[model samples]
Target: GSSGSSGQKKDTSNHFHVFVGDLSPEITTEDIKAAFAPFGRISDARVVKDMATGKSKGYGFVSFFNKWDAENAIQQMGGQWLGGRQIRTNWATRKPPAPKSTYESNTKQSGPSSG
Candidate 1:
């Protein structure tokens, strides 16, 4: 008689944010995806790369479709060796901010406050 249970909505808030660190310089996005494939369905796996040099930034992010799967991956892969380096995995607390430009100006102006 489980066919007509529509009084409440099922909770599907199992998504998780994972932060991977201590990655080997040679590690790639593909490597990360393969590492976490066994635990759960990965929504995203990306290795942070340098914008100018186009090299790995030694850290990255992995988002899983299910929190349980993400937690399993963390327990199974935390501090594990990958690409010949020790990799660390944890839950992400916050997102990194977007890149922005800084500015400073030096102009000649006649003002009473000038030194």
Candidate 2:
């Protein structure tokens, strides 16, 4: 067997990620996590702002290792008020991600090791 491909995709990528929008410019990454905390555990959250600027992009994401938790968070907090605004949320199905470098998309090399 001389196969070169590998499963190397355990990142599960965005399947457990949710995008929340309509945020107030004042929200911090920690703040995003706090609001979503009631629904499930948040493994990661970041309130992305403009490149080298103070104005927040007005949205970000929350990541949960469990798929069910991720969806539940999205469902429960999708329209909840946070940072003085009702945040909107959906599946963070973003691929080939951001130019701002805010996200590293850590789907790093789990490949080549088993080859």
Candidate 3:
């Protein structure tokens, strides 16, 4: 099924991918998994944390066995409190790459210029 965007009921099957954001510093991956356990089978749940600091990066991902389970979790948990933080949830989208620039090359020159 498809969500409102596609004119069909949101497909809650085929392992729906959820993008969870605005996470609290104290929340853990296990907590996220547990939160969804009551709704459906969770294939995978992860809290994206800072590698160096080992703290939440304010985002996460949760994969459900089906779209229906995912939809259920979203309906119940979205905009709700988690470890004292209100979370945001949505379908994950491909992020665009950052644009590259040649400003540094144009400004700094240590060697001879080419003709």
Candidate 4:
């Protein structure tokens, strides 16, 4: 890619991250990752939900190791009926994200908890 004076890579935009909506209550962090995985290798996946309230507003965020991953994810799954409800995927604008996902190794709970 460099032999042709590679100018087609790195920080092309803020597209390495994405904003996804209309996810089912049953959808988890893993669910989002797997769905978006086909596009590219994932940096991380998160679902917005309140631990205190135990419910979400049907939205989440997912990031990729590559810039095109997010764009491809949006194009492929822009409005697909995945997991029950329709999926709304697009490029993430800015900060603000929260979910029960393992950043390091999986130091999860004793048993699976329903979302």
User: Largest TM-score belongs to which candidate?
Assistant: 1
Quote the positional error of residue 52 for candidate 4 in Å: 4.6
Number of backbone-clashing residue pairs for each candidate, in the order shown: 0, 0, 9, 0
Global local distance difference test of model 1:
0.83
Off by over 4 Å in 2: 1-15, 52-54, 94-115
Q: Candidate 3 vs. truth: CA RMSD?
A: 12.1
lDDT of 4 by residue, 1-115 (tens): 4467656565535437789998998998888888887888876678998888968767898888777778887988899877888999987786677866756677766877677
Compute the lDDT of residue 104 as modeled in candidate 2.
Answer: 50
In model 2, residue pairs whose N, Cα or C atoms come closer than 3 Å (at least 3 residues apart or on different chains), thus clashing, are none
Better of 1 and 4 by lDDT: 1
| Tens digit of per-residue lDDT, candidate 2, span 4-54 | 756554554654778989988778888898887876878778876779775
Q: After superposition, how far is residue 30 of candidate 1 from its true place, in Å?
A: 0.5
Deviation in Å, model 4, residue 17 alpha carbon: 1.1
Better of 2 and 4 by TM-score: 2
Computed on alpha carbons, the lDDT of every model, listed in order, comes to 0.83, 0.79, 0.79, 0.81
Residues 84-106 of candidate 3 have per-residue lDDT tens digits of 77888777755888998665345
Candidate 2 weakest ten by summed lDDT: 6-15
Per-residue lDDT tens digits for candidate 1, residues 23-73, read 888889989888888878887789999899989998888888877889888
| Clashing residue pairs for model 1 | none
The candidate, 1 or 4, that scores higher on TM-score is: 1
Question: What is the lDDT for 99 in model 3?
Answer: 94
RMSD of each: 10.3, 21.1, 12.1, 17.0
